[PDB]
Every structure is written in structure tokens, then in C-alpha cells.
Amino acid sequence: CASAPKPKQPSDFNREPVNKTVPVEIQR
Amino acid sequence: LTAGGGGGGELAEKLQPMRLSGSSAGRLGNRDMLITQGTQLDCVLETRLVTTQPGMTTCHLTRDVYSTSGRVVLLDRGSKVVGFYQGGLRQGQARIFVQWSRIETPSGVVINLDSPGTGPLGEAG
Amino acid sequence: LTAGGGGGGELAEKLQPMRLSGSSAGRLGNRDMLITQGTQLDCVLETRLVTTQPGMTTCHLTRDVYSTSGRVVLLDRGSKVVGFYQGGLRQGQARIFVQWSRIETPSGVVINLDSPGTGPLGEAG
Amino acid sequence: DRGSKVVGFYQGGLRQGQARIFVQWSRIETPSGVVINLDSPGTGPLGEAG
Amino acid sequence: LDVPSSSRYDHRIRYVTYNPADVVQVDTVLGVATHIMLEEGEQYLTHAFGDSEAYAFARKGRHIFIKPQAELANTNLIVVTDRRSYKFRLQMRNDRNGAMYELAFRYPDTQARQTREANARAAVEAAFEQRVGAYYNLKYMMSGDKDIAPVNAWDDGRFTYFKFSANADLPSIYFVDAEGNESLVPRTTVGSSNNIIAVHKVNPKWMIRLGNRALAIFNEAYDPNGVPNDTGTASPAVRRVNKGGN
Amino acid sequence: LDVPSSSRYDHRIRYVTYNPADVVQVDTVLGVATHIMLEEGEQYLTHAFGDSEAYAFARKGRHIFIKPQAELANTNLIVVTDRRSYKFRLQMRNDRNGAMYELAFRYPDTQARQTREANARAAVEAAFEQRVGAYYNLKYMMSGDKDIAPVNAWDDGRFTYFKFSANADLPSIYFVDAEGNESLVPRTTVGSSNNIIAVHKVNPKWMIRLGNRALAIFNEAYDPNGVPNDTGTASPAVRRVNKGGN
């Protein structure tokens, strides 16, 4: 009747782009 | 045709030292032709698995297995993996342990790896 | 080419002395390039863990593990560590003892440690 | 020197009724690299065994 | 009849290139030991002397020592190993001049090989460091815990990259299928400061976990097509050829 | 032929730089001792004489000893070891002059490498002490059991320092995650009087515990970006190389 707890499922509201700036190793 | 003292045993014994040998750092030979321990081979099962009798399994990979340097394909996706299991389950257990024997790249590469089968998330058995 | 009395045994033995040998202080070889016993490796577990069948584990370090002198980075973050357990549990036990056979670095340094695995706060298993 | 590190093990667990565990210690490392391997049982805040 | 050719420092050191269909002329002078050196790891089988007693033989591994020990030492040696059969014409010199102290067998085939893979390795490394001709995706969104937030994430069509700043811990990276379950992918770490973790796939949904903090990454420019990897490596500049043959 | 040079101190000691492609002109005389030194750790394989009886051979590891024991002992010595091969032209000098006592060859590569390493070590053992050009934070709050409180706390961007007075115990310092769980961080004690404890991380919240009194440290200017670790050491002026090669 009781089983393993599922890992925390992240909230799906704060959706933002990850790259605030252009990454460097692209030479950009 | 042809030629030819010892006293205080308990307090002493529990105070025996545990001396652990040191270890030295080696180095890997070639990081392009070598797959380090613990790399994840994520194949897909072919045959349905029933543990009533000891038999063999078969699974096929689904991604190219890159070298530890991350620069060479070492096992083409679609490579064939044979494995087996034996002995069945003991009461209360919920997983069976499978050993993988051999992997075959379509291009004829055969290497004998012995590693434990795992679930989707690497959990044993 | 080449040329060539003792009676009263009870209180007798309870008075049997217990001698502990001496000890001398040594010194370490080169502190900038050694990791001493009891130094902390803090890796994040990759594989989910189930103790129903003996298997293997895998975790990646999360910090540059500096040298005992605290000057040289001897294991880069993201290093990869393989470890295993066995035997399962016994009643009442709520922890399992896992042993990490081998670490492997991004740059190809491989050093063979045999250390116990701990929870977030160093407790056994 | 204060702040040195000391490493040591234990084993066996307890038995019914016991309320302390007997932990040995093996090595001590000074900050400046002196290592000497004392092997002496550990004690609570007031010296009681284990 | 191959004539050994001397080095430019002394005439007593001579080199000869092997031939399967020619015998080696050796003019043994009296009172000297001659060193014959085989291939590295040549496995000794048997010899044969035109005169067992005109010459003194001793061997260790791939080393041979020969010496005149009788008058008129003019015979032949047929020393056979697993790989070939050397043939030496032992002619004793009378005026004890023009000695050889070692004889060398350069094998042009093996030298040709050794030259080849070195140039090949240099070319391979150069090709890898070239790293030109690629497109880069940046249409990535993240949701949930921002304290494990990578500072940059992208993909080159074959690998997916995450970058973390200097002060953060490197989390574990997990693959999400369409259904929502997670699974493992191989990962490798690259960079000057080991602050890029690279996974071996491009997928619409990535999950990042560390303890009881979970972060999800959405790949919002998913390319089902992708670029096929015919070259067999991580870069389209290098092939992967089958040495094993058979 | 390679003819050695006598020491300016004495003629009996001579040096010549080892060259595999030449012989060594050795001029022994009657009634004197000759010492030959191999490179350190040179495992002897075999040797050979132009005369087993003209000279006498003594080896203890890498020390070789050859004396005349018959007249007209003009032969050749070929001692081959694991690392290299040697060719000596043992020519006996009849006037009892120009005697030699030791020959030690020059292995240019090994001594060359050994010369440079000392330079590197000397430079390093000053570069560390240079230690200039770092940013020091000082914005730190504390709260809790104030008796344990260090007198000064700061961070360099890579290491966080705590300074305790001479009269206080050195407590245990713990790393805190986001949810408040406490976790270990490796620590090293530094300073002249061991009154400064250093941790291998920078973080917003540090927990300091001792016995049963606990103090909490909050960082008020935590920087996610930090300074990258591209040098691989505690310094931006010392690098770490993979000497293991292989």
C-alpha cells in the first residue's frame, strides 16, 4: 500500500531562458 | 638407415591497530580506445523476460557509446548484447540479477564485457 | 666468450599486566601532492540505489578536492567514481555499507582508493 | 598543533542494554605534516569509555 | 651478398637492411666479439653453424655474440627465428683490421609503419582541434530550482553542453523520455576549468538534480532530424578505420 | 672511436658522452684497476670478451671492473644491458703510463631533465608566496551562540577563512545547502599560530558547531560567478601538468 517516494518534481511555472548571455567557447 | 604482555585480552584485542596499505596514482593508456568503469550502456530489451527457468536474454543499444575522451564511436547503436540469468528469486525479492556477456558491433567488433544489468535508472537487477 | 608460585589463579591473572608498545612520529613525503586518510570526498550519486540484488554504484565529485597542504587540485570536479555493495541488509538495519573501488578524473588520472561510503554527514553507509 | 585531524574506526555495533560504542583511533595529522599513529580508545566529554 | 655499411663515427658499427633472398657477408677478424641484434621480441628457435668449433656462440633473448676460435674460420650461419631466417657468410679476416662490433638490421617495412602512425596521430589531433563548420542552438528554457542553474546551455547537434560557474557544485544530469520517466546518459566533462559537463545526446527535456532540489531544462528548438554521424567520431573531420582486418 | 677526456684534476679519470653509434677507445695498462659505472638502475643482461682469459670481469649491479691478467690483451668488450649497449676497445698500453681508473658516460637526456626540475621547484616555492591580486570580501553576518564567534572572517573567492582568537577552541565548521541540511566540507588549518581555519569552498551560509553550542554564519555578498580555476592550483601563477604522460 506504500511504496518508494518519487523524487521531487520541479515546479513548472518559473520558465526562463537559461542563457542570459552568449556563451564564450562559441567564440561569441 | 638413420642416425640415432598478552594480558587484558579484550581491551588489548579491541585496541589492535588497523593498518591500511597506501595507494599510488596510475594513468590510463589511451583515452580514445578505452571505456572506463561505470560508463552507462543504455540498451533496449528484445525478448520478454520470465524467470521461471534459467535462460538467456538479448538487448540492442540505442545510442552511440563514445570513448571516455568523448571523441570516438566505440559501439555503433544497434549493437547486439547477449546476457543471461539464473536461479530465480527468493521470497520477498522484486528484482532479478542479469549478467551481460558479449557485445557485437555490426562492423564485427566483439568484446567480452561482464557487467550487471540494471533498470532504467541504473538500479541493480 | 664469457669466463664463467602461581596459585590463586583468579587474582593472579586479573593482575596480569597489559603492555602497550611505543610509537614514534614520522613525517609525510610531500604535502602538496598527497591526500591523507579522513579527507572528505563529496560526490553526488548518479545511479538510484536498490539493495534487492548486489550491484554497483556511480557518483560524480562536485568539488575540486585539494591537496592536504591545500594548494594543488588533485581530483577535478566532475570526476567519476565507481563503487559497489553486496549482501543486502539485516533486520532493523536502515543503512547499507558501500565501498568505492575506483575514482577516475576528467584528465585521465586514475587512483585506486578503497574507502567506505557515507551519507551527507559522514555516518556509515 | 590545534586543529589537527584524527581518523579512527569502530565496528561490531552494540548488544542489548549497552548504551555506548567503543571507538578506537589510529592516526593524527598535524597541520605541518607530522604523523604519529596513536592507538587509544576514545572517550566522552568526561573520559568515560566509548 | 649484402655488405654491411658502417656508421660515420666509426667503421666498427655497421648497418644492414634485411633481405629474405640474400645472405650477409661478415668478415670476422681474430680476437673480436661480434654482436648480432634481432628484432625486438624476436623468438629464438635454432641455429646452424658450418663449423660448431670455428666460432663460439652465446645468446640472450635477441642478442648474439660470435667470435673466431679456430684457424680458417670460413663457414656459414643459418639462424632461424619464428619470423624469418637470417643467413651469414662467416669469413675470417687474416690481418685483424676492419672489425665490426655490432651489426644492425633495420627493417624498412617496420620503419615505414612507425613513420605512418605518428603522422596520422598528428593529423588526427590537428583535425580535432580544428573544430570548424558547426551550428549552435541556444533556444533553451529552465524551470524550477534556480540555485543549481547552469550559466549557459547549448548543443552542437550531436552533444549538449551545460556550463556552471566557479562557485557551484556540479549536479547530476538526467534524460527525460516523452512520457516523463528519467534515465541515464553517459556524460563527460570538458573545459579549462572542468566547468562544462557534456552529455551524449540532444533531447527536448533535460532534468537536473542535486539532493532534494530538482531543475528541469527544456530544449525548445528540438531537431528530430539531427546531423547523422557517418565519420564515426565526435567530429566530422576524422574517420574510424578497421585495423583488425580478418 | 670515442676517446674520452681526462679530468683537469687528474688524467686517470676520464669522461666521454655516451653515443650508441661509436666505440669507446679504452687504454688500459698493467697492474691498474678500471671502474665502469652504468646509468642508475641499469639491469645487466650480458657481456662478451674478445678474450675470456685476457681480462677479468667483476660486476656488482652497475659497477663493472676490468683488469688485464695476460699479456697482449687487446680485445673488445660488449656489455649489453636493458637500456643500452657499450663497445670498448680494450687496448693495453705497455709503458705503464696513461692509466685510467674510472669511466662514467654522459647520458645527456637524463642529466638535462634533472637540471630543469630543480629550477621548476625553486620557482614554484616562490610563486606560491607571491600571492597578489585577489579580491577580499568582508561582508559577513553572524547569529546564534556568539561565544564561539571567530574574530574575523573573509573569503578570497576560492577559500573562505575564519580566524579564531588564541583563547578559543577550534570548532567544527559545516557547509549548508539551500534547504538547511548540513554537510561536510574539507578544511585545512593555516596561519602562523594555527588560529585560522580555511575551507575549500565559498557559500552563502556557514554553520559553526562545537559541543552543543552552534553558531550560524551568513554570507551577504555571495557571488555565483566566482573566479574560474583554469590554473589547477591554489594560485593563478602555478600550473599543474600531466607528467604521467603515457
Short mmCIF file of C-alpha atoms in Angstrom, two decimals, chain E residues 11 15 26 37 66-67 71 89 102 116 122 125 140 143 152 175 199 213 219 222 229-230 234 243:
data_model
loop_
_atom_site.label_atom_id
_atom_site.label_comp_id
_atom_site.label_asym_id
_atom_site.label_seq_id
_atom_site.Cartn_x
_atom_site.Cartn_y
_atom_site.Cartn_z
CA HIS E 11 83.79 1.75 -39.15
CA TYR E 15 74.00 -1.30 -40.54
CA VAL E 26 80.61 -10.88 -42.25
CA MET E 37 70.87 -8.00 -32.61
CA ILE E 66 80.19 -14.57 -32.24
CA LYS E 67 83.96 -14.98 -32.05
CA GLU E 71 92.11 -21.31 -37.77
CA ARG E 89 78.69 -15.94 -44.51
CA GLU E 102 77.67 -4.66 -33.65
CA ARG E 116 52.98 6.33 -40.68
CA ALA E 122 49.47 14.40 -35.56
CA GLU E 125 44.89 15.76 -33.22
CA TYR E 140 16.75 26.67 -24.02
CA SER E 143 12.07 25.73 -14.78
CA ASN E 152 24.87 28.61 -20.18
CA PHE E 175 17.47 12.17 -19.57
CA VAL E 199 26.06 14.67 -22.46
CA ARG E 213 16.49 20.17 -5.41
CA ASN E 219 15.14 22.14 -25.25
CA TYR E 222 14.44 20.23 -30.82
CA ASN E 229 27.41 10.82 -37.81
CA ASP E 230 28.97 8.97 -40.73
CA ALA E 234 32.75 13.25 -32.42
CA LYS E 243 42.67 -2.20 -38.08
#
